[PDB]
C-alpha cells in the first residue's frame, strides 16, 4: 500500500494569511493526489484533485502543486469557515490511501470566557452522587487551566474537563470542568469554587458557591 | 443532485457481522462508483471497496476474507457487510460517489455521506443519566452522565434554541462517557418562557427531555 504522510499534524495561523498544508508519498504517484476538507461538524468535502484542479465549486483562494512524491495544499488568504483538517489522498494505486490529516486553527484576539457555575441536581443528589460543573465559555486562546477548590484547599481529582473544539463563526473555545464526588463527600464542606488561569487577565476567574 | 445516507446499528459485538447499508437519493448507483470508507479514532482513514456501475466490486485486500459490497438497484442502495468484527473495526464509516465527470478519472471520491458510527464491543448499553443544571444573558446547562456507547445526539427547546449552545466532547472514564452542554439566553426569557434539554441515545433506543427550573 502508499504510505501517505502530513508531516504536520497542525497549523494556527491568522486571518488572512497564506498557508500551507503539505503530503509525502511512499512513491511516485504521477500526481494523483486529492485533498479533502472535513468540517468540525463531520461532512467531508473534495477540495482539489489530480494535484491542482479545483473541485467545482471550491473558491480560487485553494491551490495545489506537486510532483513525484511531494504535494502541497495553499489557502491565499485564511478565512473563519476554513477551520477544519485536510486530509491528501492518493488515486494511483488501489488501495487508495490518505494522510493523517492537519487541523487548521484561526487565530483571533483574545477573549475573556464567561464563567457559570452549578451545584448538583436535586434529582443526582437522590441517586447520591455529586457533580459539580462550572462551564468557561467564549475565550481565546484555548490554553487555560481550571482548579477546583473546596472550603479553600485545592482539589486535584475527580475533575474532568473537556473543550469544544474551535467554533466556526467566532474562532472561540468554550471548556466544561466538572468536579464529581460522592453525596457523602459533597455534604461534608460546604464551598466550591471555580478557579481559571487565562492570559487575558493577571487575576484569575473564580466562581463559587455555598452548598 | 446526489445525496447519500449511511444507516445501521451503533454497537454491535466481537465475532458479529456489521451490517450496513447507504442509500442514495438525487442519483443512480448504475452509473459511476460507490465506495465504503472508514475513519478510527485519531484520523485514521481507510478506503475498504467499492462496487461499479455494472455490480463489479472491489476490496481492500486486508479485508477481502471478511467484507462484501452489494447493491440493490432498483432501490438505489448499496451495502457493507463486514464478517466477524472486532473493536478495531469500531470506526465511523462513510459512503461516498466517484460519479462526476469531471473527476471520476481522477479517482476523487467526490461526494460524501455525513457517515455512521459503528461501535464493537461485548459491553451492554447503558443509557444516559440526564441532569439539569439550574443557577443580562443566562446560562443554563445539562449533564449527560455515565452512557455507553457513544453518540448521543442533544438538542435545546427540541432545536429551536440553536444558538449560543457549546456541547462538549463527550469523555470515556470508568467505561461509560460523560458530556456536557450550555445554552445561554436573554434574563428575560427563562425562567418566564420554558428551556428543555432533550437526550437521545439511539443505541439504547432510548430519548429523554429535561427541563430547566429555578431552583
Known sequence: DIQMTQTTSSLSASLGDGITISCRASQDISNYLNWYQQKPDGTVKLLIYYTSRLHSGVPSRFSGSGSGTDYSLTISNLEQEDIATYFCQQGNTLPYTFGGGTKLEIKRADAAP???????????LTSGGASVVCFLNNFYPKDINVKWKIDGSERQNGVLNSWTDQDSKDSTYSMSSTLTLTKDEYERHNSYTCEATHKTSTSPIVKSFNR | ???????????????????????????????????????????????????????????????????????????????????????????????????????????????????????????????????????????????????????????????????????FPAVLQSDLYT????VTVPSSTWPSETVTCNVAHPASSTKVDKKIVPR
Open chain 1, 114 to 124: 464567561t464563567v457559570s457555575i452549578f451545584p448538583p441536581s436535586s434529582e443526582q
Open chain 2, 1 to 167: 443532485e446526489v445525496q447519500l445516507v449511511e444507516s445501521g446499528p451503533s454497537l454491535v459485538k466481537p465475532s458479529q457481522t456489521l451490517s450496513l447499508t447507504c442509500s442514495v437519493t438525487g442519483d443512480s448507483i448504475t452509473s459511476g462508483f460507490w465506495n465504503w470508507i472508514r475513519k478510527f479514532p485519531g484520523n485514521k482513514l481507510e478506503f475498504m471497496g467499492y462496487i461499479t456501475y455494472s455490480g463489479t466490486s472491489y476490496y481492500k485486500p486486508s479485508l477481502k476474507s471478511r467484507i462484501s459490497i452489494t447493491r440493490d438497484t432498483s432501490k438505489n442502495q448499496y451495502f457493507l457487510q463486514l464478517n466477524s468484527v472486532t473493536a478495531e473495526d469500531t470506526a465511523t464509516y462513510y459512503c461516498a460517489r466517484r460519479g462526476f465527470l469531471t473527476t471520476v478519472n481522477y479517482y476523487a471520491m467526490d461526494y460524501w455521506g455525513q457517515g455512521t458510527s459503528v461501535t464493537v464491543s461485548s459491553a451492554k448499553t447503558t443509557p444516559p443519566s440526564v441532569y439539569p443544571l439550574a443557577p443580562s444573558m443566562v446560562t443554563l446547562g445539562c449533564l449527560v452522565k455515565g452512557y455507553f456507547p457513544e453518540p448521543v445526539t442533544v438538542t435545546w427547546n427540541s432545536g429551536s434554541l440553536s444558538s449560543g449552545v457549546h456541547t
Open chain 2, 179 to 182: 458530556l456536557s452542554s450550555s
